[PDB]
Design a binder for this molecule. Structure first.
Ligand SMILES: *CCC1=C(C)C(=O)N[C@H]1Cc1[nH]c(/C=C2\N=C(C[C@H]3NC(=O)C(CC)=C3C)C(C)=C2CCC(=O)O)c(CCC(=O)O)c1C
Ligand SMILES: C=CC1=C(C)[C@@H](Cc2[nH]c(/C=C3N=C(/C=C4\NC(=O)[C@H](C)[C@H]4CC)C(C)=C\3CCC(=O)O)c(CCC(=O)O)c2C)NC1=O
Ligand SMILES: C=CC1=C(C)[C@@H](Cc2[nH]c(/C=C3N=C(/C=C4\NC(=O)[C@H](C)[C@H]4CC)C(C)=C\3CCC(=O)O)c(CCC(=O)O)c2C)NC1=O
Ligand SMILES: C=CC1=C(C)[C@@H](Cc2[nH]c(/C=C3N=C(/C=C4\NC(=O)[C@H](C)[C@H]4CC)C(C)=C\3CCC(=O)O)c(CCC(=O)O)c2C)NC1=O
Ligand SMILES: C=CC1=C(C)[C@@H](Cc2[nH]c(/C=C3N=C(/C=C4\NC(=O)[C@H](C)[C@H]4CC)C(C)=C\3CCC(=O)O)c(CCC(=O)O)c2C)NC1=O
Ligand SMILES: C=CC1=C(C)[C@@H](Cc2[nH]c(/C=C3N=C(/C=C4\NC(=O)[C@H](C)[C@H]4CC)C(C)=C\3CCC(=O)O)c(CCC(=O)O)c2C)NC1=O
Ligand SMILES: C=CC1=C(C)[C@@H](Cc2[nH]c(/C=C3N=C(/C=C4\NC(=O)[C@H](C)[C@H]4CC)C(C)=C\3CCC(=O)O)c(CCC(=O)O)c2C)NC1=O
Ligand SMILES: C=CC1=C(C)[C@@H](Cc2[nH]c(/C=C3N=C(/C=C4\NC(=O)[C@H](C)[C@H]4CC)C(C)=C\3CCC(=O)O)c(CCC(=O)O)c2C)NC1=O
Ligand SMILES: C=CC1=C(C)[C@@H](Cc2[nH]c(/C=C3N=C(/C=C4\NC(=O)[C@H](C)[C@H]4CC)C(C)=C\3CCC(=O)O)c(CCC(=O)O)c2C)NC1=O
Ligand SMILES: C=CC1=C(C)[C@@H](Cc2[nH]c(/C=C3N=C(/C=C4\NC(=O)[C@H](C)[C@H]4CC)C(C)=C\3CCC(=O)O)c(CCC(=O)O)c2C)NC1=O
Ligand SMILES: C=CC1=C(C)[C@@H](Cc2[nH]c(/C=C3N=C(/C=C4\NC(=O)[C@H](C)[C@H]4CC)C(C)=C\3CCC(=O)O)c(CCC(=O)O)c2C)NC1=O
Ligand SMILES: C=CC1=C(C)[C@@H](Cc2[nH]c(/C=C3N=C(/C=C4\NC(=O)[C@H](C)[C@H]4CC)C(C)=C\3CCC(=O)O)c(CCC(=O)O)c2C)NC1=O
Ligand SMILES: CCC1=C(C)[C@@H](CC2=N/C(=C\c3[nH]c(C[C@@H]4NC(=O)C(C)=C4CC)c(C)c3CCC(=O)O)C(CCC(=O)O)=C2C)NC1=O
Lengths: 59, 164, 233, 177, 331, 172, 177, 164
């Protein structure tokens, strides 16, 4: 669920270097195949193989 | 469910005889070709995910009219059914690959398919596009053993020639 | 109004200020359809050609053509009044009638007065002035966000596919105007420009046929509340 | 173009009779609840761009094959025409809320839409899904239950009117299918 | 055994060995060899005798017919006819049974469906009465049925279970009463035997029965018969009705449960080991606290009609008495 | 059991939707019909004994097979069974007339009635003739304008007739 | 296997008299209502593919555990036997629409169907659901209120006949449960 | 070849009797509905070319991927086979329309079609697109008698429901 309600991280107050942005795949063709299933875009990312289990039960 | 041992047991059963040396030679050949079949089964259960992913991606890479309108799949749900059906197919190729006859692939996948693909407006040529992509994709002596490759190609060809 | 196909696919308007001969020719094809005029008819229209080589009142050019016996002969003498009014819309405005009321308006302006008042009625429409003015040759317009959807369907169906020539064909919009049913999807589909993916709707199949919208069919609607579904009828 | 008044008059026209009691009684119920209809149309209008944005963005995110190469949202021009159409649909639904009768929505926009989206190759599944998203978002704004905006109005029950607006959206989504 | 495993219900219904097919693909004459024909010939005995036993000495009966099948004389249609007319097939199936049972067997042997309605019985009984035994058997074989389904070169098979024959739902269930899976022969099951006519009230009135799959316990029910009331005077005791009218429906839909093996040793009242009424051995129930010699369950196989809300309790009661459930059908 | 209302609620829960406004309008309509409905049920419940008796007289008069020795209604016991069965049929048609749904009449009486009358040797068509007679007498009794406010009751007699026709259809 | 004629004749045979006036009068109403029944059977027969397809596909979409592995429809062949069964049910319903009496449907297909589907493992609820979808779609085609096919016939009243067809479908759906 | 008179003659022949008054009433209904059937046959033989032209044009209007590459219709010859096939179909609709039963349409067009369109990689959905175009686009009052239009639509619906 993890949702903060009253919450804003400014990301303009940070020092000029320390805003880093990373894209999993830097391509057009591989972010979306012709068919619907996707591992990045849409709700289709929900249906990747793996990640079905959970490791937070250690608490 | 057809295999070596079910064909020979069912054949001698239809005869009315105990199993002579002929059936024993047949199951001897089963346990000769076994290692190549099970190697192919190990690698198929290894990377089934990426095989089905490349299969459907190339299937809509060929035919784009699938999402054109009602024909084929124009929604995320139908494409989910697409990748699920190719999951079933590779799972039956794994099963027939373990059994070593085309029995579970025939009775579960092939038998009475035509009424279903016909009635539910499913084109078979797109299935064949998926399988002929995966047929071509495997590289001889790059992963599985050369005979295992032969075993896998044979089974997949059976799927294609049974489809259309 | 985005106007999706206005400049991307459809060729640009033939404005006046370029060479006169191209304006004259393009107005022949638009005012006429693919008429394919010959030597006699071009000699017969020479005085309008003179008036438009002189001053570029292409509005007055179109008026002068539609008043001439070459246009009157074919369309007002071989052709029946239903098709006459409809073609008149197509030749002058580029577009079809959007409703039965407007078709009744044009027919009424005919029957009260005559032919010339009708022609001056098309040429003096404010809609015609905003689309074309005195200086731009008539053409088919892709506005987007039209007043009626039927305006788009009938307009495209009556703007034929490249190589049109209404001299063979018979009137497709009379039952369509009076009934309010929009034309066949195939004729609409044939007339669209290239790259519009002509008629890749028409969901046909074992499942999801839904080939003809049916007015009388009852209306159903389902929404999902956390309890379950509300169907509103 | 017929409002609720013209519907009562046209129906009474067929029998060639005066308005009478009962039809005028239902029309009295129309007039009394007019402010609720007024503020309802104000709610759907004063958020409308944002409804169209959220609905079409949701239509793409539910079905990511539209933005896939080959889909009907794949280009900028196709996407512009897409946003344009959603805006038009919400416009005529707003007209149908002011009128109280769906004659305007039937004569302007709905008549010859299936044939148009057949002619252009537009997908039915995408069209009805986006309409349904505008339906739910619109009724959520009309009950003042939006999770992003809660504007101040006088309290009152408005079940009827929300069912009416849901009936117009179901008319559009049923019309494209 | 069951339904869900193997994605095929019909294997597990006991029709596992009836899927194999035999046709003579060999045209002309067989000289020297005699493997393939002896296989087909064996399947003809397995079909027409329905797995009945033929001794080596008996094989000398029908040896002429057998030596004419091997030649170009008889198609297997006509060889099947020749096996059907001979003294064997008369002794087993015709002479032992009343005329009606004989008919139903002749469909199990020749056509492999059951009769569905009384009229099929009308046709065949009529032909027998007008013309006798040979015309009876011809009236099975000399019809558009056999010719269409088998085409004269293929040995008969059980098709009554199959959807393709129009039949009746009744004839499907009746189909499983007549065929009990591989081992059961013509007289192997009860409900056929020699003097029994198998299903008569069922086959005549097209009462669809129920299916008990063979095995998995409760394999035998052989449910008790009912009479018809004051007219055609009957005993009302023995069976629950197939119908369940109103007044008891309240409390859920009615289910007919058939319990199969009921016996004294099995019946314990829920607690293991047999109850001893007196200190020393008197194991029957004390009637009025005085010793009785009447068994607790008096016929094996009593039925229960039970509404839904009472199912659980009844489901417990059966298993208290160690009875085993044959089948449960909603009624 | 199902009553107009129960059937609509039961279907609406079997899909798990709420009731649309359309359904609620229909419900309200049937209620507004409901006084007349109770009037028809009152008529039938009153004169029921004469319906069964007279209809049995006409049954045995048109078919004098059953009263003779060896016929099916020949014994004191079997006669009583015969009359009582007619009273059963008339009872459930009165029930289904109240409920507005034909479910009670099917589930309690008609569904499986033929299996019984096969199983007993009873001629089914003779029962059907008897139910046709109860239909004639009951409708002609239902359309009597005695003691009651005037209006239109054609739809309710239509419905009632449908129930009896279903009874004679289910024995035959 | 008897229609309306055979029903009247057999009932008048047990009554042991001549046919008579009242029976013939009701049968005259049947024959005068003949062509409506003709066109009705035409509608249901010339929409067989859609009725079976949509019905069973709706049965799967309502209850998606049929298609899950271990369901009746999981096997490919099972799906084919499923579609065949839907087709046959629709077929005998069309026969009962011709005959005017359900004797054909009761004696042929309805008799022992429940116990067959019990013995094979078929869930009764899914089938009841499929028969109900065939009912609603079939009455919508018989009343020309289908949402994608609108054929021209002369207008009239066929409410009686719709209730008749719905009675046969309710007979089937009540017969499997 | 199924018609009214072949069904009743074959039925009484399977009975073993002379044709009674029931068969005579059946052929009486044949000669009642005859005039509407033959009217529809006259108009179909009138404009078959424009009907097949609109049918194929809409069939490739709906489907465009037939034209590219491996798929049928790519070359001019295959598209000529396409309009030839639709010529056969309208000619069989004319034949069954004259006969009045679905006999010649069934035995000449439908019987064993599925192995042929399945084996030769021919999609049936395109055929259905052609026929549903010729089904949707007609007016009973305008170009045919009221009964005839019904008969034509019925026959064409039979084709569609027999196809997929
Ligand atoms: C191709 C056949 C067809 C044409 C043509 C047409 O206009 N519509 C169909 C027939 C049709 N179907 C219904 C009714 C329902 N159909 C379904 C099945 C679908 N609903 C689903 O959720 C799914 C799975 C995603 C499917 C396949 C359902 C559930 C109904 C409503 C059932 C009910 O209880 O009412 C109708 C009648 C409605 C209408 O369109 O007017 C028709 C004509
Ligand atoms: C054991 C093996 C096995 C299979 C091989 C599948 C085959 C299969 N697919 C579907 C069903 C389906 N299959 C597809 C798939 C397609 N979508 C398209 O765009 C393409 C043409 C194609 C993928 C290449 C779709 C879309 C459906 C749903 C069709 C519909 O409901 O319209 C169904 C009907 C039941 C269902 O809806 O799931 C079946 C039996 N099922 C099995 O049990
Ligand atoms: C279970 C069966 C199964 C297969 C059959 C393979 C098929 C397969 N091959 C590759 C992937 C690959 N396969 C090849 C092979 C080729 N090199 C060439 O020069 C030839 C054209 C061809 C051998 C004949 C190459 C080179 C890659 C890597 C491609 C790349 O990263 O560019 C991938 C993507 C994942 C990966 O990078 O490994 C997959 C799924 N994988 C499986 O799980
Ligand atoms: C309805 C009546 C009517 C007319 C009477 C004419 C009059 C006329 N002539 C010209 C136009 C012209 N007229 C002439 C004629 C001439 N060449 C010479 O050597 C001589 C002096 C003279 C013939 C005696 C020429 C040459 C032009 C073209 C002038 C140019 O473009 O330079 C124009 C301008 C438009 C055009 O270019 O055609 C007009 C209006 N037009 C009409 O509509
Ligand atoms: C008066 C009412 C009225 C309407 C309702 C619209 C309807 C409409 N939309 C388009 C045209 C269009 N409409 C869309 C919309 C879509 N994009 C998608 O991804 C979805 C399926 C869908 C939004 C839900 C698109 C993309 C086009 C352009 C299609 C194309 O050029 O390929 C056109 C053709 C002219 C044009 O290009 O603008 C028309 C008439 N226009 C009107 O005048
Ligand atoms: C020109 C534009 C224009 C508007 C947009 C409205 C806005 C508006 N609404 C009300 C007044 C009202 N508006 C509503 C409406 C509501 N009922 C509820 O349950 C919901 C929260 C909400 C509908 C979504 C109600 C109930 C009142 C009366 C409030 C009261 O008297 O308690 C009033 C005060 C005058 C009156 O009582 O009518 C005004 C100005 N009027 C206008 O002139
Ligand atoms: C809850 C609903 C309900 C019913 C509708 C009845 C139906 C019914 N009737 C009978 C039984 C009977 N029903 C009749 C009736 C008939 N006599 C004839 O001449 C006519 C054909 C017919 C009246 C029209 C007769 C005669 C019997 C006794 C049959 C016999 O014993 O021979 C029985 C068997 C038990 C018994 O003997 O009573 C049952 C279940 N019972 C119920 O519980
Ligand atoms: C508790 C018992 C009980 C009853 C027995 C009824 C009796 C009854 N019936 C009506 C009312 C009515 N009853 C009928 C019935 C008739 N239509 C005819 O053609 C026939 C003569 C007759 C059926 C045999 C009609 C038509 C009305 C409405 C009369 C009218 O409004 O004109 C009313 C007045 C209220 C109303 O309109 O419903 C009452 C009290 N109501 C009860 O509460
Ligand atoms: C051999 C095949 C065959 C058919 C299929 C029918 C088709 C048919 N129906 C009608 C005629 C008719 N058909 C209907 C039927 C309808 N009522 C409605 O509410 C629905 C739209 C529709 C049922 C689904 C009606 C109402 C008429 C009479 C129309 C009228 O007179 O207004 C007629 C004209 C002659 C007549 O009046 O009977 C014909 C030829 N007749 C045949 O011979
Ligand atoms: C004359 C009438 C008549 C009928 C009504 C059917 C009834 C019927 N269905 C099946 C057989 C079948 N019926 C179905 C149907 C089902 N699939 C499901 O997912 C659902 C529960 C259900 C559709 C609603 C299936 C799947 C089979 C095959 C079962 C199996 O082999 O496992 C069989 C056994 C023979 C066969 O395999 O075809 C029969 C008799 N047959 C007839 O002759
Ligand atoms: C008596 C009735 C009758 C028919 C209905 C046809 C049906 C038919 N078509 C083909 C054969 C063919 N049919 C087509 C037609 C198609 N091209 C496409 O792009 C579309 C999918 C489709 C038109 C809508 C094509 C292309 C072939 C040749 C296929 C090939 O050789 O690859 C063949 C095989 C023999 C041949 O090559 O001609 C047959 C039997 N023939 C008959 O005798
Ligand atoms: C043998 C059977 C047979 C048919 C059934 C028709 C079917 C048919 N109609 C048209 C053609 C046509 N059909 C119509 C009819 C319509 N007008 C409308 O308002 C309604 C939607 C509809 C009447 C209900 C129209 C208007 C055309 C001309 C379309 C056009 O040119 O735009 C054409 C193309 C050739 C032509 O222009 O005539 C054909 C093949 N022709 C045949 O040979
Ligand atoms: C990832 C692809 C994706 C989207 C895009 C969204 C789109 C979306 N918005 C919804 C519904 C929705 N959307 C809004 C409008 C929106 N919210 C606000 O508070 C403001 C200011 C808005 C415009 C900026 C509202 C008000 C609702 C109603 C729910 C709510 O209370 O927030 C719903 C629910 C539909 C329903 O109830 O049937 C969806 C699916 N969902 C997705 O999965």
């Amino acid at each position: 669920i993890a949702n903060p309600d009253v919450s804003s991280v400014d990301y303009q107050l940070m020092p000029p270097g320390s805003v880093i942005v990373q894209p999993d795949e830097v391509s057009a063709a591989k972010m979306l195949p012709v068919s619907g299933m996707s591992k990045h875009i849409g709700k289709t990312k929900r249906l990747v193989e793996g990640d079905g289990l959970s490791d937070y039960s250690r608490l | 469910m057809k295999s070596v041992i079910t064909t020979t047991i069912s054949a001698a059963d239809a005869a009315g005889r105990f199993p002579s040396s002929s059936d024993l030679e047949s199951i001897q050949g089963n346990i000769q070709r076994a290692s190549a079949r099970l190697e192919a089964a190990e690698k198929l259960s290894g990377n089934h995910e990426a095989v089905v992913k490349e299969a459907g991606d190339a299937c809509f890479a060929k035919y784009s009219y699938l999402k054109n309108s009602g024909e084929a799949g124009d929604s995320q749900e139908k494409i989910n059914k697409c990748y699920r059906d190719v999951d079933h197919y590779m799972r039956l190729i794994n099963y027939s690959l373990v059994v070593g006859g085309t029995g579970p692939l025939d009775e579960w996948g092939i038998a009475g398919s035509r009424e279903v693909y016909r009635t539910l407006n499913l084109p078979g040529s797109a299935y064949i596009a998926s399988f002929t992509f995966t047929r071509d994709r495997l590289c001889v002596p790059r992963d599985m053993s050369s005979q295992a490759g032969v075993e896998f190609v044979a089974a997949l060809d059976y799927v294609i020639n049974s489809l259309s | 109004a985005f106007s999706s196909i206005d400049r991307i696919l459809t060729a640009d308007p033939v404005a006046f200020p370029n060479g006169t001969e191209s304006v004259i020719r393009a107005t022949y094809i638009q005012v006429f359809g693919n008429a394919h005029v010959m030597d006699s008819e071009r000699e017969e229209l020479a005085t309008a050609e003179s008036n438009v080589c002189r001053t570029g009142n292409v509005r007055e050019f179109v008026r002068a053509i539609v008043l001439s016996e070459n246009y009157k002969s074919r369309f007002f003498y071989s052709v029946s009044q239903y098709r006459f009014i409809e073609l008149m819309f197509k030749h002058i405005l580029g577009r079809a009638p959007e409703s039965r009321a407007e078709y009744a308006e044009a027919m009424a302006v005919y029957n009260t007065k005559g032919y010339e008042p009708l022609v001056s009625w098309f040429v003096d429409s404010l809609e015609y002035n905003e689309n074309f003015g005195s200086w731009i040759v008539p053409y088919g317009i892709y506005q987007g966000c039209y007043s009626s959807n039927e305006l788009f369907n009938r307009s495209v169906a009556m703007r034929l596919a490249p190589g049109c020539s209404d001299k063979g064909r018979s009137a497709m919009l009379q039952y369509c105007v009076l009934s309010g049913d929009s034309p066949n999807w195939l004729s609409i589909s044939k007339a669209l420009p290239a790259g519009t993916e002509k008629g890749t709707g028409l969901c046909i199949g074992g499942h999801w046929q839904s080939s003809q919208r049916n007015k009388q069919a009852p209306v159903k609607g389902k929404s999902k509340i956390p309890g379950g579904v509300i169907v509103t009828e | 173009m017929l409002d609720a008044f013209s519907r009562v008059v046209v129906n009474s026209d067929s029998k060639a009779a005066y308005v009478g009691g009962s039809d005028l009684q239902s029309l009295k119920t129309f007039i009394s609840d007019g402010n609720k209809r007024l503020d309802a149309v104000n709610c759907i209008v004063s958020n409308a761009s944002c409804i169209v944005s959220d609905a079409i963005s949701g239509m793409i995110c539910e079905n990511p094959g539209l933005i896939a190469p080959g889909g009907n949202c794949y280009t900028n021009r196709r996407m512009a025409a897409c946003l344009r159409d959603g805006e038009i649909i919400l416009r005529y639904v707003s007209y149908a809320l002011l009128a109280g009768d769906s004659s305007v929505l039937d004569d302007r926009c709905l008549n010859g839409l299936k044939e148009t989206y057949i002619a252009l190759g537009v997908p039915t599944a995408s069209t009805s899904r986006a309409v349904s998203i505008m339906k739910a978002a619109s009724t959520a704004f009309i009950m003042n239950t939006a999770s992003g905006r809660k504007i101040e109005i006088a309290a009152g029950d408005c079940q009827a009117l929300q069912s009416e607006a849901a009936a117009y959206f179901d008319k559009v989504g049923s019309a494209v299918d | 055994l069951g339904t869900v495993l193997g994605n095929s219900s019909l294997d597990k219904l006991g029709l596992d060995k009836f899927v194999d097919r035999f046709e003579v693909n060999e045209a002309g004459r067989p000289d020297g060899f005699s493997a393939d024909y002896e296989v087909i010939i064996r399947a003809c005995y397995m079909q027409i005798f329905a797995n009945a036993y033929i001794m080596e000495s008996e094989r000398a009966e029908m040896a002429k017919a057998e030596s004419e099948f091997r030649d170009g004389r008889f198609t297997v249609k006509e060889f099947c006819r020749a096996l059907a007319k001979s003294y064997q097939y008369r002794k087993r199936f015709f002479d032992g049974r009343p005329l009606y049972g004989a008919i139903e067997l002749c469909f199990k042997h020749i056509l492999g469906r059951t009769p569905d309605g009384l009229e099929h019985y009308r046709a065949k009984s009529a032909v027998y009465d007008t013309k006798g035994y040979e015309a009876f058997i011809d009236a099975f074989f000399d019809d558009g049925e056999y010719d269409a389904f088998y085409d004269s070169y293929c040995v008969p098979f059980y098709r009554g279970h199959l959807t393709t024959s129009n039949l009746s739902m009744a004839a499907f269930t009746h189909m499983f009463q007549v065929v009990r899976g591989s081992s059961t022969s013509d007289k192997a099951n009860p409900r056929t035997m020699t003097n029994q006519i198998t299903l008569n009230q069922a086959g005549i009135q097209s009462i669809p029965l129920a299916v008990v799959a063979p095995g998995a316990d409760g394999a035998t029910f052989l449910a008790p018969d009912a009479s018809a009331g004051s007219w055609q005077t009957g005993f009302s005791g023995a069976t629950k009705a197939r119908t369940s009218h109103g007044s008891r429906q309240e409390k859920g839909k009615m289910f007919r449960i058939e319990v199969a093996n009921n016996t004294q040793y099995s019946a314990v009242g829920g607690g293991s080991g047999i109850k001893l009424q007196s200190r020393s051995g008197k194991f029957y129930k004390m009637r009025n606290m005085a010793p009785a010699k009447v068994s607790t369950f008096r016929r094996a196989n009593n039925v229960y009609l039970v509404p839904f809300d009472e199912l659980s309790a009844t489901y417990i009661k059966i298993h208290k008495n160690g009875g085993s459930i044959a089948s449960i059908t909603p009624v | 059991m199902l009553d107009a209302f129960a059937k609509v609620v039961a279907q609406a829960d079997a899909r798990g939707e709420f009731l649309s406004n359309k359904q609620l309008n229909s419900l309200e309509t049937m209620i507004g019909e409901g006084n007349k409905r109770l009037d028809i049920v009152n008529k039938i419940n009153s004169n029921a004994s004469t319906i069964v008796t007279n209809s049995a007289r006409a049954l045995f008069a048109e078919q004098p097979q059953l009263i003779q020795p060896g016929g099916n209604a020949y014994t004191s016991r079997r006669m009583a069974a015969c009359l009582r069965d007619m009273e059963i049929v008339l009872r459930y048609v009165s029930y289904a007339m109240t409920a507005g749904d034909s479910s009670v009449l099917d589930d309690r009486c008609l569904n499986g009635l033929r299996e019984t009358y096969q199983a007993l040797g009873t001629p089914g068509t003779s029962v059907a003739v008897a139910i046709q007679k109860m239909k004639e007498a009951s409708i002609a009794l239902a359309n009597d304008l005695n003691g009651v406010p005037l209006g239109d009751c054609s739809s309710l007699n239509s419905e009632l007739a449908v129930y009896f026709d279903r009874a004679a259809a289910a024995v035959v």
